[model samples]
Target: SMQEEDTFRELRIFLRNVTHRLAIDKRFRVFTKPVDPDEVPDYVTVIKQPMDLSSVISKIDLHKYLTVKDYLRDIDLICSNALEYNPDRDPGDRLIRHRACALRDTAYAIIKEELDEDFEQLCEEIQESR
Candidate 1:
């Protein structure tokens, strides 16, 4: 019991460092933890819930160039709004989020133009807003 407790305490301290590092870093730092990925708290998905643009981009029927562009504008709005109040002025998160949003938009556009189907549905399923 004592060994387990000590190990847990050390783990807590290490995780705090992780939080601080993540908050302070100016980019999305993806690291492989010793623990299982499925068990970890996903910081990426947790931030998108209050942001309401998820529906516009998540729907299966909206994967055209026009819709992707429109969704991108909305994503930019959300990113701007969040950046305004982001406690940590880390440009990395902002940059990563913007790039990720753009990538999603571009992917949707390509899928629509090439595959002639909704590939955003896959992304919508994979990355939940919340």
Candidate 2:
């Protein structure tokens, strides 16, 4: 019900996904080591990216976007359609995946300059360890 709660949940899940990817990518020594849940970034404390997007896409009503649609309708219209033409698949589910990937790309574009500045400071320490 609270906008704050929705925002927090979104950010937490987003960060968890990032940290998981960081571990998987193995490109950065700072994050190459495993992280404890407590040690992972508290995105709420570090957020410079804005979440209140009602201003950019003005027609989008927040309440409506968050509302859950009926499962039966989803199954009949979306799932059946997705499943119909695949040789070995069913219930094509690309919409959610596409949106989530787009959101990640957008976030990095907005914050890449700032994040790179921070990431650069770790080079000396990482070099010493390597």
Candidate 3:
């Protein structure tokens, strides 16, 4: 049904805006790619499943998400993994951990904003059909 596919236009646009906004932030630029195993072998051990902005972008390009919720899972995982690995509990460990926090905060904000508009609009239609 067109409802399934066309309804996802908001997801596509929201993700595009999200990536654009995050890309503009200098701190998040370095997170665009996967962690290098050779550079940080412990990272592999710390995280069996790795998630990164680059991979997320690739997934978006390929339309890998079944819904907007699926996309958020990866975003959450990427930030959660960083928080776990970096610990940020130490005095000087605030670098990447701080970034992880920053990224997560910004990401959630975007989702919340989009959903308000999306949910408000889609709510009218989605409730009528089924």
Candidate 4:
């Protein structure tokens, strides 16, 4: 009866499949969990919307996402937060930033192909409905 729920079913699969890659990618492995404030005291103050793969999965699991782009926004945040907290000047920060970029690239590659098609179909469906 609810078209929105039915629509989200397809997108959720894409989000799961995509995040699974992030789950497996060695570079992004460290980011799968929340950053420990005790370990990195400065990170908590530097980034407000601290995001991670596990949280993203929970959001997806709880049916919090309405669109694929929302999932992408979270993914971008995961990378951008690291880039903000870990600047490229220092060796360690540079490593973190690079890995975040890798995560972004990997996720985007999968989404751009899969989501673009599904999202494009979605866009057309809406325009046609109007």
Top of the candidates by TM-score = 4
Model 3 lDDT vs. the true structure?
0.75
lDDT of 3 at 99: 81
lDDT of 2: 0.32
lDDT tens string, model 1, 1-130? 5644443344334333323433333332221122233753553454443332323223312332222334445445444444443436478656645644554454345435543234434334333432
Give per-residue CA lDDT, model 3, range 1-130, as digits (tens): 7766666665667687787788689998757789877888888888978998878878887877645567778888888898787785676457887887788888878878766655545634653565
What is the lDDT, from 0 to 100, of the residue 1 in candidate 3? 72
Which is better, 1 or 2, measured by TM-score?
A: 1
Question: Scored by CA lDDT, what does every candidate get?
Answer: 0.39, 0.32, 0.75, 0.83
**Model 4, 1-130: lDDT tens per residue?**
3675567776778788889888988888879999988899987888999999999999998987767667889999999999888776989898998999999898888877767775746834643565
Residue 18 in model 4: lDDT = 88
Give candidate 2 regions above 4 Å deviation.
Answer: 34-130
Top-down lDDT ranking = 4, 3, 1, 2
Q: Quantify how close model 3 is to the true structure by its C-alpha RMSD in Å.
A: 3.6
Per-residue lDDT over 8-123 for candidate 2, one digit per residue giving the tens place of the 0 to 100 score: 34433433443344334422222232223374365334433322222212212232222111111221222232223222422333543333344444435433532344333343
Worst 10 residues of 1 by lDDT: 27-36
Residue 124 lDDT (model 3): 44
Q: Clash totals for all models, in order?
A: 2, 0, 0, 0
TM-score of 3: 0.77
Angstrom error at residue 51, model 4? 0.1
